[model samples]
Structure formats: structure tokens, C-alpha cells
Target chain A: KQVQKKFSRAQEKVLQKLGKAVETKDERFEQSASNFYQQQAEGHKLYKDLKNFLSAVKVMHESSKRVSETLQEIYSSEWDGHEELKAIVWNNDLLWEDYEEKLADQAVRTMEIYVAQFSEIKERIAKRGRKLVDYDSARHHLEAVQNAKKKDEAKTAKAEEEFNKAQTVFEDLNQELLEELPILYNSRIGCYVTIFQNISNLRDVFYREMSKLNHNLYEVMSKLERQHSN
Target chain B: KQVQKKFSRAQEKVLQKLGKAVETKDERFEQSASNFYQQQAEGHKLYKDLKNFLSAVKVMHESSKRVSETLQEIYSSEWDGHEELKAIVWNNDLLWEDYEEKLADQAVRTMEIYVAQFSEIKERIAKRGRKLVDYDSARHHLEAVQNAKKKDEAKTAKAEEEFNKAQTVFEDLNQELLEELPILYNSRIGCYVTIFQNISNLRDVFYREMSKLNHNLYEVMSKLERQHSN
Candidate 1:
């Protein structure tokens, strides 16, 4: 009981931090870049927690199995003929039953959570994949324009006299968005998600919130574009 | 004109689909998903094109350099005559100038596009990382509960006798959502994202529409959840 209590306390401590991390964004710009930074740190900590938990669980499980096996062996052997053998048998049965129930319940929850998180992680990955495509396309267009202007001396001179620095900036945008940003986002998101989920019901809410946000944002943007263009 | 036409056709063949994919859906959900897929494929092809272009330019660059070197060598020679060599020198100078311009412009663009795509692909990956964190947390929670019950049973047979059936279903749910559901989502999203993005300017329009739908859905659900809980 003492061991179990201590273990639970430690686990809860980690969970508390994770819960707090989910909503740790600056009150000013909910969408501000700082949110990404905080979230990332939390996520990183969660990842570490996961690894640690797995190690701890494995050790507990092995030790428990050994203890159970030894108890079973002792009960069935020399202890069988002893005066207190029946009582020993009864106590062993009760302990084994209780330990098994607790362990199984914990394992089941852990497994379910593991599976759910794995899938969600992959879904998020697919989303980012889309952004990568956009970066690639822009870069291609920039190159195509550059190539067209380079074919002839007169054309080159004409272009040089025509567009100035604006063309260069246009060409560099892809590098800014596609090449530089992914690295930052990947690290940030990885750390943030891990931390938030550990703290509270943030994972579920995040799924619920982000999905709707994406959808609504798309709609509002569409209407604005339609009204402005038409 | 033929070269320009061919290049444009190839570019259009790729860009047309990519443009469409951005706002389209693949009989699944959301235009962003569709656009995301199209962009990844297009990005890959763009890299191929840039690589080929660079290789071709490299050859041309080397050849031009060689010709200029030859002209300089002969012109500075003691035995070379001025009248006969003047045209050769002028022709080499003109060719070098034209080739150099083309190489500079095209090479720069190709490199830019390649580098930019690298970033974009990475961004998609990062976004996925964030999603993964959330998914994993949910999975962990479910597993924890399930394992606890399992352990409870093995510990106390009497306790196990009562909860066998409920425990089974709990285990099953863990297996289903935690284990298998995500696989389907991941596979489907990849296919859907590609098909959706290939249609045109419609990609952005589609994103807007999907966002709107999602927002409405969220509003409805949140209201329902609140009402039921209240």
C-alpha cells in the first residue's frame, strides 16, 4: 500500500504539469507564436515521461511476476504440510487476486491511451504534409520565372531594368516558409502536445477544438475572398 | 518557342492538379487534406524537374567554360593572326555571355525550389508530430484504466468472478480504437488529401467551405454536450 501510494503520487505530479501546460499560452494573442513554444516544451516533457513510465512499468511487472511465482511455489511445496498451510494458501490467493486486478486495470487503460495517441499523432503528421506541398509549389514557380528571364542577354537586361528587388523577395518566400519553418514547427509541436496531455483532458479538447477551428477558419476566409474578389 | 511550350505544358500538367487539389475533397473530408496530398506529390516531381534541369545546365556551363578557355588560349598565342581570330573571339564571347546568364538564372531557381520543398515537407512532418502527441495521450489514458481492471481480476478471483464480462468489452474497446482505427484514418487521409488538391483555385474555396462546416458542427456539439451535462 505504501509503495503503491508513493508511485501514484509521483505519477500525478507529472500529470499536473502536463495539464497546466495545455492552457499556458499568453492571454494577449491566443494565436501568438509563444503558445507554440510553451506547448512544445510540455510535449517534450511528456515524451520523457512516457519513456520513463514504460521503464518503471516493465520493472514492476517483472518483479511482481517473480514474487507471485515464488509465493505459488512455496504454497504448493514444503509449506503444504505445515500447520498454517491453509491460512497461507488463503492469504496468497487473496493477494494474487488483488494484485492481478489492479495491474490488469492499469495495463488496459495504458494500452488504450497509447493506441489513441499513436493514431492522433499520425493524423497530425498528414496535416503538416500538406504545408510541405505548398512550400514546394511556390519554390517551383519562383524558379520558372527566373529561368524565363535568363534565356537571352536582351531579356536579362530588360528584366534587370524592369523588376528590381521585388522579384528576389518573391523568389525567397518559399525558402522562408517551406525550408525554415517546418523544423521549428516540428520541434515545437512535439514538445507541446506531450506536455499538455499529461496535465489534463487537453488532448481530447484539442482534437475537438482544432478540428472546428480549421473548419471555421476555412469558411470565414472563403467568404471574405468571395466578397472582396466579386 | 518549342522549348518554352514544352516546359509550360509540363509545368501546367503538374501545377493544374496541384492547384485543384488545394480546395478539393477526396470523397472523405476537408479540402486541406486533399490539397496536402497533391502538394506532396507535386513537390516530389518538382524536385525531379529541378534536378534534371540542374544537370543539363551543369553540362552547358562546363561546355561554355571550355569554349571560352580555348578562345583565350588561341588569342594569346604568338602564332595566331588577328584578322582570322577576331570572329572566333567575338563568337565565343557572345556564347559565353548568353550561356552564363541562362545558367545563373535557371540554376538559382532550381536550387531555390529544391531547398524550399525540403522545408515544406518538414513542416507537414512537424504538424503531424503535434497531432501524434495528442493521440498518444488519449491512448495512454484508455490503457491505464484497462490495465488496472486486468490487474484487479488476477489479484482477487472473487472480484474477477463478478466483472468478467464488463472487463471483456472494455478490453475490446481498447483494442479497437486504440489499436486499429487510426490505421484506417491514416491511410484514408493520405489518399484523400492528394485527390482533393488537384482541382484548381477551388482548393482554397474548398478549405473555406470545410472550415465552415466544421465550425457549425462544433457549435452544435458543444451546445449538446453542455445541455446534456446540465
Candidate 2:
């Protein structure tokens, strides 16, 4: 609690200092940009590591799920005594396997996207930096800077649109996972319910973090566009 | 063995066909460019994913290293019998904590640089995609395409330099953990060693893959530049 309070105070001071640094009001763009990159960095760590970790879990989940289904058949039809392993097991189906791949791929793709965005922003900054070194070059750079800003805004709009469409697809999948898949799998095992709940929670956390970063990034771009517009 | 043999033959056949596709001297550059992009895309996936995974491991490793050091102090001397209660071990050194933060920051910054390069590459592709409608536009688009290729090569060079620097830093840290830091702690707590080894391996794999990709991407870039310089 002490550490949290101290950190918050420091954050507040930094924010105040940032606000005072620019001639332009709402330097929140810079702050948000910095934070967005930090989030991108941290988020990449979380998602990527989780993906690698989950790959193993996926194999385990799928095999166990398969074994369970097989055991259920064996128990019902034959005089098989392997009901014990069935109780101890859980498996991943095609749905789970596909989801795992998609999620992992998405995580990797997102990091790649942010890394690309970072380079774009950095180049923009560097170009601006170089131009600022001379008066005539500065004017040229200023124009280029403005153009870059505009391009970034346009790109943000496109990114937002694409992100929204992607989210819609995800939400539809989320609905099926929640509304339909559960009902489909409910008769299979109680363990499936636990796994489903966990999966939902994990997915929610991921989407929430990703969506939040992207939206905040969009907001920063919008604000920068407003402030920098000629 | 059967699967490996089948995959090997399939791979050979694909490469043989690809080699033949570029045999048409006039059309060689275009085919080579396409193949380069395709290969680059594959390499990008491997490098980016590996980097992210390594970053996460590096963070976790640093955290564990600190904790392990503190725990060792508690175990070997003062808080000897309290095995389960070593979590309270604390360090007040700003430099030590700062080291971890710096490592994380470096990883993040490097990732951003690479990501930015990719976005620029993608944007260039999109721009060329839009200009391929008419012959005049196609002419201009071809130049833009060549320019983009050169830009990507430059980007690859820059990314390579950055990754190499990062690899050096990663190696130094690994050496410190494996050679220097372990001396401070009791060897019985193999957790530190495990974490260090894992993180080191992860970093090695990432660096090796990115370096290889960087080399390949640059070679492709050079080939294109040579063909298109006329």
C-alpha cells in the first residue's frame, strides 16, 4: 500500500510535468504514446510467453479431451475398467486446438504490429529531429512532420476500422463459445465447465488489454491530429 | 523417419520448382522479389515471436534471480529455518532494480524498432498495390516497389545492428547470472540456475534466428537492387 501510494504520487508528478512541457495544451498525446508503447512492450511479454506455455497445455488438453471421449464410449459399450483415467482426464477438441493456434498467432501478430508501429513513430521522430537542426531544413521537416502526422491519423483510422471488424468476428466467436459451445459440451464432463470458464476469463483478459491499448493509441493519434493540424 | 523423408522430398521439390520459376531471365527479379517477401514473412514470424517469448522469459528470470538471491541470504545465514517464509527478503538497491528495468526497456525498445520497420514495409506495399492499375502508374509503381525493396533492406540492416547489440547485452546478462550471481546463492536452490539457463537459451534462439533472417533479407534486397538498378 505504501509502495502503491508512492508510485501513484510519482506518476501524478510526472503527468503534471508533462502537461507543463509543451506550448500546446494536452500533451497527453506524448504521455499516452509513451504509455502505449510501454503497454505494448509489457503486453507482448505476457501474450507471447502465455502462447508458448499454452502450446504444451493445448496438446495436453486435446489428448485428454480425446481420451475422455474415447473412455466414455468404452465404458458405455464394453466392460472396460479404465474409467479411473477418464475421471482424471480432460482433452482439447478441434475447437480448442483451433482457438489455441488463433490466439497464439494473434498475440504474435499484435507484437509484430506494435513493433512496426514503433519503428514508424521513431522514424517520424528522427526525421523531425534531423530537420530541426537547420532553419530551411526545419521548415521542410515541419512539412514532412505534418504530413507524417496526417498519414499516422489516416492509418489510425484504418487500424481502428480493422480492429473493430476483427473484434466483431471475435465477439461472434465469443458468443458461440459462451452461448452455444457450453451447451454442446455440458453433457460431456463437469471438468469441461471449469476449463471453459478459465478459457473465457483468459480470452477476456487478453482482448481487454489489446483493445484498451489500441483504443488508447487511437485516442492519442486523434489528439495529436487535432493539436498538430495546420 | 517416414514423415521426415516425405517432408524432405516435398521441400526439395518445392525449392526445385521455385528455382526453375526464376529461370526466365527477364522475369527473374519479380519472382525473386516475391520469394523474398514470402521468406521474409516467415522469418518475421519466427523472429518476432521468439523475441517476445524471450523478453517474457528475461523479465521472469530477472525477477526470480533477485528473489533467489534474497532467499539464499535468508536461507544460508539469518532466516535459516524459515524455508517457506523467505518471500519477505528485501533489497533496497536502486541500481539492482534499475538493471532489471533497463533490460526490460532495451527489449521493448528493440522490438518497437523492428515493428516500425515492418509497418513502413507494409505501407510501401499498400502504396504500390494501389498504383498498379495503368501502365504509367505501373511504371511509377515499379520504381516505388524497388524503392520499398531498398528501404526494407536498409530496415533489415538497421534491425540487424540493433539485434546484434541486444544479443551482446543478453549475453552479458546471461554471463552475469550464470557466472557471477550464482556464487552469491546456495546451489541447492536450482531454481535460479533453471531460470537462468532457460532465459539464456531463449535469448540465444531469438538472436540466432533474427541474425539469420537479417542476413537473408539483406541478400534478397541486394539481388533486387542489382536487377532494378537499370
Candidate 3:
């Protein structure tokens, strides 16, 4: 009797997981997942662009440094602004390093975190799909046994037990994802805002600081040129 | 008699190209060609790096532009330096565009021209190698036929003709390269000096002009922030 009761409970669980819920199709969850996928793609493209930007920065930094080093080699210590030129080169190198460092920390790291969440969630969604298929298959088996004229109670009971297990496992994962995808999708707005703001803010500071050093170098060169002309 | 005379001429030409005045190995020509190849490689790498830098500048320019635009959207026009903020944003855009343009025109274009010269020279070098082999083969065939116990006069004559033809062709091209390569190699020093000087000079001017605008922007932002605080 106890075994029969348990089988009846399992049958009810599978029927619910595979019936109205599957039929209605959680439109909201589907919409949210779609949005999440789109957001992930958008995030990835932006991150890649940012990474390329950093690589360019690195190249420019090195190229510019070489130019400075070349100039230093040509410039005699007796020349005007020799000491100042040294300082400007050092300052420029540091500025580029600082800018690149900040970009990596504030922009790339944040994007990485956001992108990292995706693979785990995607795996869960895949698992949920497989479990749904399992629920359907179990339902068909249970129904087949129940409809038979010579009903094997033990067979029906076993089918019901398997169905219930698949239903519970699937629903737990599905419910978590249903709640999380929307939240993650919405968070994209904040991420975009933060990254853009951080880049601009840093750029403004960098430009302001570097401009002073640039002016000093320019003044030195102009003075030297004037001296040579005279 | 004609065959013997032709073979003698071919042998003399080979001695000149392979040894004679040109032989202790045209050290200067070799040095020049080596330098040209090294310059070409270095120029290519630098050009690529410059291109990457330009792309990075574009990304940063667009990214920062959007950030400033966002700030403009959020700021109340009633705030201090409202008009100045607008000017700063416009100036910033122009500055980035100007920077990229100067880099492309002065730096990237110069490297491109320097690099372009390499392909023709490279092809010629490869062709010269092949022709040298032809000269060697023709010489060997003529020698073999001349030394044969039953010399086929017709075969010896044909081999002499081929040998002479190959020698003239190889020497003409070799002479042109020998003369041109040193001049080209000598030009690389001036090119390097000019390019580096141009970049440093432009950088000086860019920094000076940009510093003025940067100061203006910093002042505007400072005033706006102060106004908001009050």
C-alpha cells in the first residue's frame, strides 16, 4: 500500500512538470534568456574592442619610448633641456603604464567578471532542457503501463519514481535560472555606464597631466632650435 | 674559332662577377643590401605598430566622446561653464581626429614608402640568385663539351652562346643592384634621422597645442564641479 501511495505521488509530480508548464511555455523565462544571450554577446564584443584598444596603447607606448630614446642618444648633455628631456621621457613612460594599468583593472577585469557568469548559466540551461526531455519520456512510460489491461503495479510504480526524480531535478535548476537571467540582463546597463565613465574619466586626467609634460618638452625644443638658429 | 672566342668572353665575365674587382665580395654592396633588408623589416614592424596605435586612438576617441556626450546629457545647462563644456567636447573630438591624421600622414605613410621599396628589391635579389645558377650551369656545359675527346663543334658553339647570354644578363642586373643598393642603404640613415626628427617635432607641436585645450577643459570641469558643490 505504501509503495502504491509513493508511486501515485511520483506520477502526480511528472504530470505537473510535463503538462501545463511545458504546454504554456514560460514566455517570460524565454524572453529573459534571450535578452541574457544578447547581453552576453554585446558584452563580449565590447570587451574584445577594449582589449584591442589596450594592445594598441601598448604598441604606441613602446614606439614612442623608442623615439624618445633615439632622441636622447642624439642629444648631447651640453644641449639645452637635456635633463628636462630625460624627465619628460620618464614621465611619458609612466603615464602610458598608468593608463594601461587602469584600463586593465577597471575595464577589462569588470567585463571578464560579467562574461564569466555566462558559461555556468548556459550549462544549467542545457541541463534543464535535457531534464525536460527526461520528464516527457518518463510520462509516456508511466502512461503506457497505466493504460494496459493487465496492469503491472510494480512497473507503473518504477516508471513513476523515475519521472518524479527527473521532474524535481529539472524544475530546481529551471526556477533558479528563471529568477537570475533577468537580473543579469538588466545589470548590463550599469556595466556599460561604469566602463565608459571610467575610461573617459581616466582619459581626461591623463590628457591633462601629459599635456604639461608635452608643453615642457616643446619649450625645450623650441629654445634649442632658436639657439641653433642664432 | 667563333665558339672559342665566345667561351673566352663568357669565362672573363664570370671571373668579374664572381671574383675580379667585384669579388673580395662587394663588401659595400653586401652591407647596403643587408642594411636595406634590416631596415625593411624594422620599418614593417614599426608601420604595423603605428597602424595599431591609430586604431587604438580611434577607439579611445569614440569611447571618450560617448562619455562626454553622456555627461552633457546629464548636466544642467544652467551650470557654470556650460558653453565651455560643449566647446571642450568639440575640441576633444577634433584633437583626436587631428592626432590620427598626422600620425597616418607623416609617420605611417613614410614607413609605407620605405617598406614598399623592399618587395621590388627582394624580387630582384631572388632573381639574381637564380641567374647566378644559370651562369654556373652554362659555364659547366661549355667546359664539359670543350674537354670531350670527340668534341661536337655544334654543341660547344651552342653552349658558348648560352653561356655568354647568361653572363650578360646576370652581370647587367648585378651591376644595377650593386650601384643602387649602396645608395639606397646610405639613404636609410637619412630616412631614419628624418622620420625620428619629424615625429619628435610633430609630437612637440601636438603636445603644445593640445596642452592649451587640455587646460581649458580642466578649468571648465573644475568650475562646473565647484558650481555644483555650491
Query: What TM-score against the true chain A does chain A of each candidate get?
Result: 0.29, 0.32, 0.82
RMSD of each: 43.2, 36.0, 12.0
Native contacts kept (model 2)? 0.00
Candidate 2 residue-wise lDDT at B141: 29
* Winner by TM-score between candidate 3 and candidate 2: 3
Assign candidate 3 its CAPRI class. Answer: incorrect
Per-residue lDDT tens digits for candidate 1, residues B1-230, read 54653453344345436663121122432243444454555545444443443354345335434433433342223322333344434553454355435434543344344346445444544443333332333343334445674555444553343245334544444344334334432332232222212211232333344344334333433433343342
lDDT of 3 by residue, A1-230 (tens): 54654464456456667664233246776677677777777777777767766776777677667656655664658767788889989999999999999989987788788888899989988777666666665676777789999979899889899889878987898889888777776566456556655666676677677767766766666655654442
Q: Per the 3 Å backbone cut-off, how many clashing residue pairs does candidate 1 have?
A: 93
How high is each candidate's TM-score?
0.21, 0.21, 0.54
In every candidate, what fraction of the native interface contacts is reproduced? 0.00, 0.00, 0.09
Residue B70's C-alpha lDDT in candidate 3?
Answer: 55
Candidate 1 at A140: error in angstroms?
84
Backbone clashes in model 3, listed as residue pairs: none
Deviating ranges (above 4 Å) for candidate 1: A1-230, B1-38, B61-91, B110-121, B139-230
- Number of the top TM-score candidate: 3
Off by more than 4 A, model 3: A1-28, B1-95, B103-230
Candidates 1 and 3: which is better by lDDT?
3
